[PDB]
Amino acid sequence: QAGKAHSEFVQPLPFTLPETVPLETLQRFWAHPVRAFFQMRLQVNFRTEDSEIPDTEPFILEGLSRYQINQQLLNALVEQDDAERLFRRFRAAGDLPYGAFGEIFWETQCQEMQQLADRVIACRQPGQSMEIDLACNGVQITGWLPQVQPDGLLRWRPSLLSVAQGMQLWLEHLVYCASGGNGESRLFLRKDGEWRFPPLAAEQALHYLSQLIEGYREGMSAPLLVLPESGGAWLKTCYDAQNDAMLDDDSTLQKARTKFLQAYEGNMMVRGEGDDIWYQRLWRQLTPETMEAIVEQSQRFLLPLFRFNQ
C-alpha cells in the first residue's frame, strides 16, 4: 500500500482563443459544456455500444423514435401540409404500430402536435436565412441563422421545456441582436413551455456575448462545471424575477439544495442529469465542495437566462 493515490483529474491547461470561432462551435459547446471539454478540447469521446436490436415489431414508440416523428410531424403541421401523406409514409416504412394501433397512436400524436402548431402558425411570418459576421473581443463569429422573419427569431421544437433549450436560444438571440435585428426571439416547446427574449441594444448584446465567449476559452482551458438543468433548478428557486435579486434566505437555500439533488439524482420515470459518462469520470461521488463550485459557476453564466426571460 505504498503507491500514490490518483490525483484529481481536473488540471489547468493553457489555451489561446483564435480570431475566428464558428457559431456551430459555440452552440455545440454550450449544449454540454462538460462533454465539450472532453471532445472539443481533449478529443475524448466515449462511444456507447449500439443498443441491442429490439426482437419484436414496436408496439409503442418511445425515446428517439417518437421524437423524430414528432419533429417530422410538427414541421409538416406548421407548413399546413397534409398529415395523411406523412402517415402513409411512416406506415409504409413500418416504423409505426401495425393496423389500428398505428392509427390510434398517430391521431393522439396529431392531436397534441396540432395544439402546439396553432400557437406557432399565429405568429409565424415568411422569412429568409441570414448570415452573421461579428467582432467580439477581437474574435470573428461566422455562421447562419435559418428562417429569420422581420419580427425576430422563431424556433419550435417538440420536446419538454429545459434550460438547455433556453441557453440555445439565448446564444442565438444575442448573435441576432448584435447585428441589426430589432425584435424579439421566441421558442415553443411541448406542454406550453415557451422562451421569449425581448430585444436588446448592441452594447448589452456584445457584453453578454463577451461573457459567453470568455466561458468558451475558459471551458477549453479547464473543465468548467456548469449543469444547465441542475444548476438551473438551483438558480430558479433562489432567483426572483419581481425584485431581480437572488434570495439569501436559508430556508429557501435548503429547498434549493433539495431541488438541486432532485435534478442531479434521477428516478425511474425520468433519468437524471447527474448520472452520465462525462460527469462520472470527473467524480465518482458528488462532494458538497464541488457542489458549491457548480452552484457558483452556474450562478455566473446562467443568470442572464432567467433575468431577461418572460
Binding site: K191, N267, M268, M269
Partner: protein, 98 residues
C-alpha cells in the same frame, strides 16, 4: 440456479414502484406548501370586498368574517389547502404525463 429468482425480481420491482408513487405524493405536498403561501386569505377578502358590496354586503361584514371570526379563517385555510393540493395534483399529473 434460483427457483424463486423470477418471484424475487418481481418483488424488487414492486418496491421501486411504491417509492415512485410515494415520491410523487411528496412532491405534490411540497408544491402544496408553496402555493398556499402564494394565495393568503386577504386576496380572497379583497375579492369579496369587490363583488359582494353590490349585492348588499357591507365592508364590515367581510371584515368580521375574515379578520374577526376564527372558524371562518380556519375553514378557509383548509379550503385553500384543498384547492392548492388539487391544483398541485393536476400540475404533477401533467408533468408526469409523457
Amino acid at each position: 440456479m434460483n427457483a424463486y429468482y423470477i418471484q424475487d425480481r418481481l418483488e424488487a420491482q414492486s418496491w421501486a414502484r411504491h417509492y415512485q408513487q410515494l415520491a410523487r405524493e411528496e412532491k405534490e405536498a411540497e408544491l402544496a406548501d408553496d402555493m398556499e403561501k402564494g394565495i393568503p386569505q386577504h386576496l380572497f377578502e379583497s375579492l369579496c370586498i369587490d363583488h359582494l358590496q353590490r349585492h348588499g354586503a357591507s365592508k364590515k361584514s367581510i371584515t368580521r368574517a375574515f379578520d374577526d371570526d376564527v372558524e371562518f379563517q380556519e375553514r378557509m385555510a383548509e379550503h385553500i389547502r384543498y384547492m392548492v393540493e388539487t391544483i398541485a395534483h393536476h400540475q404533477v399529473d401533467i408533468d408526469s404525463e409523457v
